[PDB]
Design a protein around this ligand. Structure first.
Ligand SMILES: [Zn+2]
Lengths: 50, 174, 282, 125, 91
RNA sequence: CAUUGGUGAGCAGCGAAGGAUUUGGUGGAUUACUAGCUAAUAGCAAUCUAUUUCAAAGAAUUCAAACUUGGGGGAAUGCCUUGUUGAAUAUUCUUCAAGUGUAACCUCCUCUCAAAUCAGCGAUAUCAAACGUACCCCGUGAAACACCGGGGU
RNA sequence: UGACGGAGCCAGCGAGUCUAACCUUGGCCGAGAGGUCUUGGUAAAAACUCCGUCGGGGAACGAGGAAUUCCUAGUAAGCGCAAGUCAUCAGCUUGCGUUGAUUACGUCCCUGCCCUUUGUACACAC
RNA sequence: GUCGACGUACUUCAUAGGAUCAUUUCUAUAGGAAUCGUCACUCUUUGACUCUUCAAAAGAGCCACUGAAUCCAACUUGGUUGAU
């Protein structure tokens, strides 16, 4: 796993570099809720859920 | 607004169905027989029903024994020997210099039972009549057929040697 | 450069691992050449191959220094760097200068607050053959590594009996001319690795009558190196000693540089083994 | 959205991540104003990208800078680097180009270390 | 091997020193069609000049020097993933 | 406390009988403008036909012609090339033979990657629930510092 | 190149169900091994910035003689933190980061070392 | 010092009986089933075509006129005797 650090080739572009983000320390963050649909409730959904 | 990486449309071979070679595109566990013990085969009782090869007839002539009268000497009980329809199709196919065996094969005490096959080859007509029932008692002297039946459990194989016949997998020898 | 220098390592591996699978084909093409030359019988699995039969019609035209040193071997002079561990004692900072004098083409760069990456990586850039780093215990120098730079091997040496040159007398200063060498008692194939990794630290082709000769002697698994001058009298050669006495012992041999620390270990001195004291070059 | 520009600044082992966005004119370092930098003598070493070009050009922008690594001095060389880079990379993006070449010629004549990292890579003799 | 020269010289050997294969070998684009999509749109370059024919043969020596073309929208997105853009480069 | 994240309520401000986003279709450009048609020194353009023909001119390899073929090996039968047998009076036709002759025809190669995905497996982790430990409370019960259930921190 | 006490903020390597002491008085339980509690003794990021306060040695010793060696930029030097990787070191070793200069960078005059003394290589020039 | 001779030790070498497919009829065998000018419906498989998700990237570019859809502002109608 350290051998892959030596050979990162920092021109690599995979198309899932839009859904993933990265913390400012440098290691990535992944959501607790995981799904694409459990992101954050809209105001119309909260107006019903309250 | 035309798309990128366009390429001339051409014939898939690994995927298309119009090609001849690409046109092509419940378990079964047979129960071991309700007769059979571990190897004992507790159902076979006299009289016996014995299948016969071509080879068992040919070495019966060289060793001067009757079929029916000579089998009862080895077997000590009554037996009904019965040549299948595939085996008689071999005995005719052996030809002119085996015709004295073909006379002795058609004897009204030698029974005949038909089969539903597409073939002459009686070496594999015979084992298939044995797995599906396991009441028969094979009389062969083929080397490859003996090995084909000694792996089958509980089927008394019978061969000819020296003077009289010999049996192998009968527990009730005497 | 950094991407180029990495990818030549990757292809050098795949050119090396190809040879191990083609060493078997290297062996069988000896049999075809000899049996064509003298001898009828031909073995079974080499008989049934039609692949290797057609393959031989090209292969009939084919035919030693180490594979890392192979491109440079006699052509280019080495340029080497003797550098010290970290905040050196004033005894060993003298002793790096005797290593700087024992080789030709050797410069001494004092090390402090360099890292081993940016001293390696700022040396492949400037282009040097290899790197000599020393260590010490309380002024007595103990260890020594030579590490060939263009992804070449390294050899961590332990060196026990040292006598620095500055202890003795103000007898003068060394000859500094290209030395002859003396390699004694190297029989093992690992012993030939230590031959070809030490030998290329000297400038190629010494004169037939240069006057200082550097012996590398291997009695009892401790490579013992001394520095000598010689003159030839009317009957015998008479010699005298200048420069350091070493005992020396390699104990691990990586295929990468001394930067790398996870490279493949060609050899490693096993201490803790039931037959450790028995064998030689083990 | 919000117009921003992110530039880096680097001395010995200290980074400096300066987000520059259009705003009101506040300049923060680590969630603290730039008048409270630690070494207190080198505070005018980070007022250089403020005072070289003129303090008017910070009236519409925000300079959020956060630094890690380094020491006391070698962070001050990182915040003066990322404010100069963060100012001169906002005028080529969201303000006028002729502003940028006025700035890049202003920081150059004063001290080129504001823009490009003076990397003191080793030399063997 | 001297008999690679008759046995291993195949078109699929010479057709994988193509540029879009090399951009898939160096893990630049995800797939091999998608690399043709990035060459044709103009995001890749060899040294100074960008390359626009997809079918550019690339020397093993020249295989070092393929990069994304600078200030591109596809070399900008890569640097946002590592949170390491620097718009003084206007990456 | 920070959002350089999403939704959604408001205000300052900008604000001439409204504003913003998105898109279908046609036109004019995208190089430097001398008109359409035909049988074209002229005629048409409502049409060339009951002048549209004759005359003139016009026939080279005495029958040059795949500059075009993925690479090995073959080519029986073909075809080509040369040699020959036989007939009609040098060519035409016919018969047989031979060619490290072959862009017909047989055969092996021209695929199997210093590759990447999807599926299994599954770690550093995460959310919830139950269960465990201690602690007070409530029901059941006549009652047990309850050896009955439950709630809570 | 001070002494003390607060306050201020700055790193980079490092994470194997593995990381760690001795001696003693005394109680209780236990057939014992031992358990448990008790008791005393002995070992074992900094510089930096800011404020407050201050103005001989306990004989060898007040910054180290002649001589002598190393040393050219993130270098000399100052500072602490870390790990202990089959040799080597724990009386220490090797890493890592912080703050970081002066003086050369010329010349063969000296002391050494070395090379050459057919121009051979092909122009022109010497 | 190496290479023979002998002794020892291991490794290796021969398979056979059938059946089917292979020739633009026919693999050699008569012990084998296939010669038809088609009209519907159901079901399944594959391919385009238009949108399109993981998920972007790039626009043969600019103007003019006419047409449409969405979103507020406005107005009208219904709406606490109950709109969503
Ligand atoms: Zn049958």
């Amino acid at each position: 796993l350290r051998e892959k650090a030596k050979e990162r080739n920092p021109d690599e572009y995979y198309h899932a570099m839009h859904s993933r983000k990265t913390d400012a320390k440098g290691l990535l963050i992944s959501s607790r809720h995981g799904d694409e649909e459990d992101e954050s409730l809209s105001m119309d959904q909260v107006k019903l859920l309250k | 607004t035309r798309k990128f990486g366009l390429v001339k449309r051409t014939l898939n071979t690994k995927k298309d169905q119009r090609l001849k070679k690409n046109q092509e595109n419940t378990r079964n566990i047979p129960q071991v027989s309700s007769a059979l013990f571990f190897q004992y085969n507790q159902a076979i009782k006299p009289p016996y029903q014995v299948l016969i090869d071509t080879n068992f007839i040919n070495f019966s002539i060289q060793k001067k024994v009757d079929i029916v009268r000579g089998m009862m000497d080895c077997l000590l009980a009554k037996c009904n020997p019965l040549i299948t329809d595939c085996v008689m199709a071999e005995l005719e196919k052996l030809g002119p210099k085996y015709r004295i065996a073909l006379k002795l094969a058609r004897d009204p005490r030698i029974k005949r039972l038909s089969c539903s096959h597409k073939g002459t080859y009686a070496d594999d007509c015979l084992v298939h009549r044995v797995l599906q029932h396991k009441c028969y008692i094979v009389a062969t002297n083929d080397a490859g057929l003996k090995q084909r039946i000694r792996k089958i459990p509980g089927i008394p194989l019978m061969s000819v040697g020296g003077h009289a016949y010999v049996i192998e997998k009968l527990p009730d020898v005497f | 450069m950094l991407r180029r220098q990495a990818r030549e390592r990757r292809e050098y591996l795949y050119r090396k691992a190809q040879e191990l699978q083609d060493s078997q084909l290297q062996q069988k093409r000896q049999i075809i050449k000899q049996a064509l030359a003298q001898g009828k019988p031909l073995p079974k699995e080499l008989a049934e191959d039609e692949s290797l039969q057609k393959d031989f019609r090209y292969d009939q035209s084919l035919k030693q220094v180490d594979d890392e040193y192979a491109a440079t071997s006699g052509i280019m002079d080495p340029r080497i760097i003797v550098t010290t561990s970290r905040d050196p004692s004033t005894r060993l900072s003298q002793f790096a200068k005797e290593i700087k004098l024992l080789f030709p083409n050797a410069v001494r760069l004092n090390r402090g607050n360099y890292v081993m990456p940016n001293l390696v990586d700022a040396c492949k850039k400037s282009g040097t053959t290899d790197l000599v780093v020393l260590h010490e215990h309380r002024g007595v120098p103990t260890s020594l590594t030579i590490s060939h730079f263009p992804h070449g091997p390294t050899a961590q040496f332990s060196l026990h009996n040292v006598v620095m040159r500055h202890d003795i007398i103000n007898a003068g200063n060394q000859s500094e001319v290209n030395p002859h060498l003396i390699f004694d008692n190297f029989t093992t194939a690992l012993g030939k690795r230590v031959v070809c990794i030490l030998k290329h630290l000297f400038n190629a082709g010494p004169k037939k009558d240069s006057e200082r000769v550097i012996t590398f002697a291997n009695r009892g698994d401790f490579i013992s190196v001394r520095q000598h001058v010689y003159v030839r009298t009317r009957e015998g050669v008479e010699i005298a000693e200048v420069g350091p006495r070493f005992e020396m012992r390699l104990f691990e041999l990586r295929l990468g540089t001394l930067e790398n620390k996870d490279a493949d270990v060609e050899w490693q001195l096993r201490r803790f083994i039931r037959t450790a004291n028995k064998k030689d070059y083990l | 959205a919000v117009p921003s520009v992110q530039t880096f600044g680097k001395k010995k082992s200290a980074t400096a991540v300066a987000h520059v966005k259009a705003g009101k004119g506040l300049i923060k370092v680590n969630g603290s104003p730039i008048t409270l930098v630690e070494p207190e003598i080198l505070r005018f070493k980070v007022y250089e990208p403020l005072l070289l070009v003129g303090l008017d050009k910070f009236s519409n922008i925000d300079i959020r800078v956060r630094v890690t690594g380094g020491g006391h001095v070698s962070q001050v060389y990182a915040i003066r680097q990322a404010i100069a880079k963060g100012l001169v990379a906002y005028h080529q993006k969201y303000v006028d180009e002729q502003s940028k070449n006025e700035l890049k010629k202003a920081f150059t004549s004063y001290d080129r270390t504001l823009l490009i990292a003076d990397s003191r890579r080793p030399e063997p003799k | 091997k001297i008999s690679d020269l008759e046995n291993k010289v195949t078109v699929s050997a010479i057709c994988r020193r193509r540029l879009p294969v090399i951009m898939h070998r160096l893990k630049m684009a995800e797939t091999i069609q998608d690399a043709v999509k990035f060459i044709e749109q103009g995001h890749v370059r060899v040294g100074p000049n960008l390359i626009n024919d997809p079918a550019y043969l690339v020397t093993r020596n020249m295989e070092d020097y393929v990069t994304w073309v600078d200030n591109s929208k596809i070399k900008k997105t890569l640097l946002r993933y590592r949170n390491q853009i620097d718009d003084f480069d206007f990456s």
